[PDB]
Amino acid sequence: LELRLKSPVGAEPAVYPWPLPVYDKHHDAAHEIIETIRWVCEEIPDLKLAMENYDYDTKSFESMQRLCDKYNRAIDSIHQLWKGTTQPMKLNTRPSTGLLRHILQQVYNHSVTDPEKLNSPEVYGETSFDLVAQMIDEIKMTDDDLFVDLGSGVGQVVLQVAAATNCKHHYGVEKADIPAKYAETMDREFRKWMKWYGKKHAEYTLERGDFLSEEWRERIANTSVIFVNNFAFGPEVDHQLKERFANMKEGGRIVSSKPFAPLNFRINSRNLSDIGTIMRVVELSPLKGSVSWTGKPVSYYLHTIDRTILENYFSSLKN
Numbered sequence: 001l002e003l004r005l006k007s008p009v010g011a012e013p014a015v016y017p018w019p020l021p022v023y024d025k026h027h028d029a030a031h032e033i034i035e036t037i038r039w040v041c042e043e044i045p046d047l048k049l050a051m052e053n054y055d056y057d058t059k060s061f062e063s064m065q066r067l068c069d070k071y072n073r074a075i076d077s078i079h080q081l082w083k084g085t086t087q088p089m090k091l092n093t094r095p096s097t098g099l100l101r102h103i104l105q106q107v108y109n110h111s112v113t114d115p116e117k118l119n120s121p122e123v124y125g126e127t128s129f130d131l132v133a134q135m136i137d138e139i140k141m142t143d144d145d146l147f148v149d150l151g152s153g154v155g156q157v158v159l160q161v162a163a164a165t166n167c168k169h170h171y172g173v174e175k176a177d178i179p180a181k182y183a184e185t186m187d188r189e190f191r192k193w194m195k196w197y198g199k200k201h202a203e204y205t206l207e208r209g210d211f212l213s214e215e216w217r218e219r220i221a222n223t224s225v226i227f228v229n230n231f232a233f234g235p236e237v238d239h240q241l242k243e244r245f246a247n248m249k250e251g252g253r254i255v256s257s258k259p260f261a262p263l264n265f266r267i268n269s270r271n272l273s274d275i276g277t278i279m280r281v282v283e284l285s286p287l288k289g290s291v292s293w294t295g296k297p298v299s300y301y302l303h304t305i306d307r308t309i310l311e312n313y314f315s316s317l318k319n
């Protein structure tokens, strides 16, 4: 006993057992099915027309099977329309944000079956989707860039960014054995679903490793965009990263939850070896409604490597 959904681009259908599993208090497979059908109507305007007719009894097998069947047969109809003069769906484009959010929800739920082994507090960043999205809007990125998430967890922020941007490569690095294991599954599931919807992504890799290691020094030195959720790192790790940041090329960016250099920073003669000297540090606007683990309106920081701040001080003395 089963329900199946045909891929709009000929990939292996998606197959769900019945009764349909529940994922957590707020997500189940019924609604995964309903949403998936609606995003595919958004990809294909003709399907929207044919499907025009749709609430459903998610508990009733045959009320669900009707919806599936009506969806599968309209897909057949559509592939037939592409055999004619009509042109196939613009293939290897990138997913809209709405769709990406659905996809990453799907991938997670198919990959992290026991979310109980991920322990009370927010240290892995579960609903940071919108946040990363805002960040992706502000920090323009081009095919010249390299991106790294430092302490990449199960991998969701690497996948979101690789999907959204066109950097020449996207890296994630994780130290702990459990999430690196989950990240292997996440990577699989993501590739499969992205094919299923017929959507393109940038190159990305999910590695195992310590970002404080010797190999990672010059790796960090050559990365142009670094995302780092450093809220729970503690003072010693911050200090080590600061060192590694000193070797970064000009223009390099660092976006974080805690600042690595003060906002009010005027160079004087007692602070000459501070990282402050080599970087611009702004505070970014948070999203109305998001809160930190301290029940607190959040705040985030953009650091740009700009050495001309220093050059200027070695002229204010030649004055």
Ligand SMILES: CN(CCCNC(=O)Nc1ccc(C(C)(C)C)cc1)C[C@H]1O[C@@H](n2cnc3c(N)ncnc32)[C@H](O)[C@@H]1O
Pocket (backbone or CB within 6 Å): 123, 124, 125, 128, 131, 132, 135, 149, 150, 151, 152, 153, 154, 155, 157, 173, 174, 175, 176, 179, 209, 210, 211, 212, 227, 228, 229, 230, 255, 256, 257, 300
């Ligand atoms: C932060 N990270 C998991 C969160 C998943 N990724 C994010 O949240 N990225 C992210 C999210 C939001 C933002 C912004 C844009 C600031 C909002 C920027 C980045 C913690 C992981 O770091 C791992 N970790 C600890 N120290 C480690 C070490 N030295 N080397 C390897 N990994 C280590 C630790 O095991 C844990 O899995």
